[PDB]
């Protein structure tokens, strides 16, 4: 009945192992974090070597113990399929969460359409983003379904571009339109000139007819580029006696 | 025939087992709980560590009656297995159970849009997620479901920001129209002045002229403050002389 | 060729085994009934209990005929795996089959809309729901697809809210319209009035202009309260003068 | 030279094996078929009883001509895999197969939509529904994806409930549309009139306004009940001097 | 060095082996194909049963060469494994290539919809089914796609089913319109006449009212059916005066 | 410290080993080849071949170093199962890179909507396929995608059809239309008149009377007959003083 | 006590083995890299190489310190899984981060649809390739998602084509509009005359007749050609007298 040993065997080499373990942890990812592969990287791959460490210990201590080994494998292996499918989720949230840190398609603060939804965007933390729509609302979207997922961004590209559509009525003049448009893009300050420049016939449409006018701005001038040469091509057009045609439609008339 | 001394061999190592068994996880969620890690990660880890080993107890009790021990594993894990798969369900929606609490995105009586239905949030159990529609109904939605979808949240931003789009006749007054506007929302208390404040001229419409109007304003504030400056542009836009055009249509005339 | 005693062995092994296995779960689920943990947990992890003695009963009673102890494992375990996958899609309709008795996020009688199919709930059986479409269908969702969806819930909220949306005509009086709603339900005896009670501008619309009338009921209540408003707003707004519009559009005429 | 002995060991253990194996089948449904369990749940079952006896009787077999013994478990359960692989579809098939029969949410006979799809249903074999749409298409659905679905059934409610929009002109009277259409479900004998019976003003709509009425008949009476009932309100409105408005349209007249 | 005897032993072995396993297969599905239980369930299980023999002859004949026979279940299973992955995509188009030739819900010939596709049906290969839309085009469905989706069957009904839904103006004869229509169908000799024949007051349109005509004909005759009776309706109610009414529209007018 | 000849055992067996591997690949698709099966069944069956002997000799060669050979099944195996993983996606793009190969439901030049993209086919290599819509773009198919997905192939069959719906005024000569139609497709050439030909009155529509004309043609002409048969019934209806009539619409007029 | 001769055996062999490791895949992917099989099909293969060389050396410099051997392939494995499971995502992106390098179906600079999404691409990266909308937004989209999709190239075909669809007015004149028309595309010098090359009378329209024109270019031309072509079929037209009818339609009116 010393043969109680064995249950001082256990507790033995469970804390020998235990402080073993985390010992060898702070000391994998002491040489990882030194080879700065990554802040969480390091986490995840020495919390791992830690965590087999304190795997092996157990069977060992209840070896000594007599349990028989094999069935340690069995119950923490699948125990651990256990842990492993419940944060299964998560886990692939971290991925993108590491992945969305380095190459950072969208960097803090840019204004991106990702998942559809679309906001200038806040922080990257571990498991999720959140973004704020220009509109005053927070929207948190899961790393994975943003890294599974188109990453449209507007803001790392510094020059945007505008595209007006505009319509005038079918007897109006070809040239005139193109013309007092060519010098209206021409007056503005905020338009790159040496850039795409175009202003051309688009369109025969329903009621009307189509000019379509694209010219390229600053990242910041564009959305104020648009408003400010919109506020004109409706006054140079009134002025030079150009209509936009109400929607237009012939009838033919007959009494019954 | 004191062989059956096995039989009690067995119930003295499953009574003995499932007794050192259910002190292990009481202490074990003892440190766990006083680490104060989370509240149901120690129901989680700690009634697994009381569970394996009450599952090692099954195998030494058994394999002193005569159990093969290689087909208590089977056995066993196999119909873990079953209670896996039917509760597997469930078990993801307890992760974010824990996920939804710690982070929460949105937090009880917010108003939030997550999964297309949108409502006030009542509290997040277990594995659910009650709300209600600011129209008097419960809508109960599955804690995963939740996790894996944007969640998009009205209320932690306290400054929301409306926007008016309206329209005026083709030959009404481009400056006025702007004019009567910036003064509309220079009158109102409500509206912070210091954020973003425009007013212009958008879009070219069919029958009509649209002018877009951008105000933030407190969040609790932001609806009465639409409903108050609507109340007022449809007076101030009519006693200026200004028409909110019906649906214009230009008919050529044919007798036939 | 007394050796065909195993064949014996094995009918006295399968019979011992078969009649301590039925007994150790109607004694298993003895405990779990009273512990009331559940009706179906109790029948579900009890008949599994039973379950997995019968196959340790077979592997004894087949090693004492000689059969390898290794491919009962393999026979049994895959041909249960059989078994398994066949009924592996009901047995997931009985997750939410005890989940919804529990939780029951709508009772027997509650009008929901979950799955997007609405109806008065009869019974949550094993399997599947039951419900009636106001309409006098039976519907019958699988409890599975259930308890993965929204769960929309008209009842268990017994105070309900309507929202008329009604129009004007461009000149009629802003203001007038405002007085003789607000005093319409300020006269309904089944309207709260203490609760949410807002009655403004909401929409410059197309041929008309929208008021929005909000106003919380009971929850029995809310279906007529609807009814018995329009039925008066219609007369109270055609006594007073005001119209309807219908759909207005203005031609701008020419003879070609 | 006689350790071919084992060549004849084989053929009398698969063969000694494979009789002992087709007649314990015969003998476990035997107890299931009058257990009166099920049809085809004895078939499934037994056929798999039936088979793990010639999955054994094949390993001794072999083992006597000396085969590995451990790799007659990996080519037969792995080529089991394959067998299962392939006919894992349809395995899900008879899931419902049997699952559709009993319980049977629709019976023989009934019009049910489920899965889209809307017919009266003739038989509910194996594998698959067979149904008629009232067109007369023969539309098979697998039975999986029925029970994977919502089952809606019309017949199995005996009393349904008819609803009919109706609209008039705006000055139409707001209580004679009331009492001409009270006064026609209250003359009709198909008509339940202890059930609800509603008539109301339902909607200020575009160019009309629509009064609903609902009506519970008999499950057969119903699709006639309607038809009936309409072929009178259209007379009894006509003959009383309500016009059912042609689409309205105020046109604001101008000459350019 | 006549362990060499070894590289004898596998080239013996392998095709002492290769040999009895040809034939066996040609043996079982000897069996199988005068059990007559199919064409290809013969080929996909006995050239099985000829392939877990080649399976344990490579085992047998490796091992007297010195191969750990471990490591060849290993092999081999893993590297079946990987034909299996490759060709498991097909092999469930073999499993519905079986099971559309058996059951035929659409035998060659029909036309049929099935997976929204829909045409007539020339072929079910092994894999895939040609079609044929009436249209000229040949479409090729992979034999999986068909199989879990509803097969719709416009043939093997005999007796299909037309719907007229026509329009007359709102002052029609609502009994001469029954008795012109009553009349019409009558006087047809391709319509079942004791079948269902309905002619009523379906729907009080827009600018119309509708009635709709229900008349069961043969199967081939259904198309002409309607072409004849069509041309027929158009004539008998412009001779009898019923007006087919343009799209009626009320305009109530002002002078601005 | 001659137990380092075990390290050259290792580099005589790898060697040994490699070199009897690279060639029973060479000699077991040197019989697949003259076989003829295919020419990637060859590379990915005997390159299989091939590899599982360089698995065998790792172990042997390891083994003699002194590596515990059921470590290198776990090593090989699982880090096997990598580069299965990453490969998995287009190990499944070449079965159907074969799968198109042969069958081919399209064969190189046919014009085919598959996956709803619709174009001229190239080249189907091994991953994907290559196609040109008629618009002058390059769209490339992974053959996976493909074939999942409905063929749809318009080439295979020489014989297409063409349909032509055209309205008339509602007053037009119900068989005159008739009969100038028949007589245009009379004098076309092009048009296969022992094949389906019909012409006939389709649909009572809402501002016109529909005609619908069913003709084959030969796949090649199909495009032109259309064009050519339009370019006809427009000058031959006009010319014989039918009206292809613009939207209809009656007004009742009405001043207020 | 020299027992902890092991733990310095394990020092030992763990840096004997991670320097034999680390030397074996620079050995590896130096023929590799040589052999120019690819730049990360040698980073993947070789860093498995000399991965599985540090993982064998794990377990013999465990089972000299005393760790069981069959729970080192245990931890390891299973911890390997772990890796696998959270970089699985990521490693499906490598694959199609290598095929889209190779076949290159879309390179640098290329104007590409694919997964709805399209514009010019910059660089395609190991994960994820970037793109720009010639709107002026970078689009950062997933290698995996990619390959799985159609990928479609406007670039890669050096010759174009365009599709103008024109109206006229009923009575125009069939030939002049064709004639117009031929000569318009006969003029211009950007249009391959060779090529296809179509003028036809393709829709008898609801208010117009619709003439299409096909006519192939250079593709840097393309964009160019059309609004050349169109700026020209506006005056062309207007000169010779055609309209593009406003959208037409025939009143027939009614004093009530």
Redesign the interface.
Known sequence: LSYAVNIVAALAIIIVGLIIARMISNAVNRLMISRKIDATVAD??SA?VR??II??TL??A?GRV???????????????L???????????N???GV?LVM?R?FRAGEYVDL?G?AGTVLSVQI??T?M?T?????????N??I????????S??P???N?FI??VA??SD?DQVKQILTNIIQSEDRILKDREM?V?????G??S?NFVVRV?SN?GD?QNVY?DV??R???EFDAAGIS?????????????
């Open positions: 995840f791959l791992l965590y087999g795997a092996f069977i060992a209840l007599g349990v028989q080994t094999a069935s340690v494998i069995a119950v923490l292996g699948a125990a651990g256990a842990v492993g499918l419940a944060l299964q989720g998560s886990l692939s971290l991925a993108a992945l190459f398609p998942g939804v498991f999720s959140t704020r220009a509109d005053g609302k927070i929207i948190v979207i899961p994975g379904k890294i599974a997922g188109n990453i449209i961004n507007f790392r590209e020059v945007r571009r595209e505009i319509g079918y007897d070809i175009t051309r016939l688009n369109e025969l329903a009621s007819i390229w990242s564009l408003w919109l506020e091509i409706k006054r936009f045609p109400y929607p237009q439609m012939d009838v033919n008339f007959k009494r019954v």
